[PDB]
Design a protein around this ligand. Structure first.
Ligand SMILES: [Cl-]
Ligand SMILES: [Zn+2]
Ligand SMILES: [Zn+2]
Ligand SMILES: [Zn+2]
Lengths: 113, 113, 113
């Protein structure tokens, strides 16, 4: 019987317990997956599963804001395009003289008066 | 032999089957990791691995759009800076009178005519 | 003893080794979780844990840029609102004639001169 007592004992050491052996490695695997504290700070605390689910919703969120902003900037580009194509005129010289508008330039009123 | 029959039976219950024991806990671990349905909605359906890979590419994507938008807004800020520094003039009073441009103000033409 | 030799051998095949059995499935599970090469390209290379932690910081980052850009565009919308509400005037006709400002329109100076 001493051979089977041997072999049997080897398998016990082998399956191990919560702290060692196959049973110890699997306990650690489930601890990591599930997590210690769901409202925890770390990935290990939350567990793999909860961390993946969180990243998921956060990505989804940033994406929504990014779709909204892209739209805002498109309207912004059109607003600026409009102002640029408006053909506004810049201030006339400030030199104590009166000016009027002719062919793109600002001309001295006194040249007609 | 009754002691070894004992010990042996204990290890069987211990390794368990697909539904229980160490074999049951590991089956669940591989189910979660791999997934039930890859084109599935949930993290558990897709499996941990596929979920992490997905978040990965999605992050990468939002990042590209965010780099592109940042550039668009930089050109926008310069376009607005330009329009602000242009020195355009605002509408002259609407009061039935003619005005001309002198030193920042709008002056009545009749003051020269 | 041949029955227990039987049962014992079955459990050995069952716990298996690094390559097969329960011991083989758990070895693979820990390989995937931890990773082969942390500065590796793939999710499997980095390990599940390191991949989740990475996605995490990257999401956090894109989020910061997205908060900053949103602010930039808000100031941009106000800058454009301001320019639009300014009431600037567009270029006067380019036809060899002098013009002055009256009631929204550009009038020929010669109509007073
Ligand atoms: Cl993730
Ligand atoms: Zn000229
Ligand atoms: Zn004045
Ligand atoms: Zn008219």
């Amino acid at each position: 019987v001493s051979g089977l007592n041997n072999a049997v004992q080897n398998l016990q050491v082998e399956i191990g317990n919560n702290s060692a052996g196959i049973k110890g490695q699997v306990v650690a695997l489930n601890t990591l997956v599930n997590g210690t504290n769901p409202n925890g700070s770390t990935v290990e605390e939350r567990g793999l599963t909860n961390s993946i689910k969180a990243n998921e919703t956060n990505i989804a969120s940033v994406t929504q804001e990014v779709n909204t902003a892209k739209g805002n900037i498109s309207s912004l580009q059109g607003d600026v395009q409009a102002l640029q194509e408006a053909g506004y005129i810049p201030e006339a010289p400030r030199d104590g003289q009166a000016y009027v508008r002719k062919d793109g330039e600002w001309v001295l009123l006194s040249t007609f008066l």
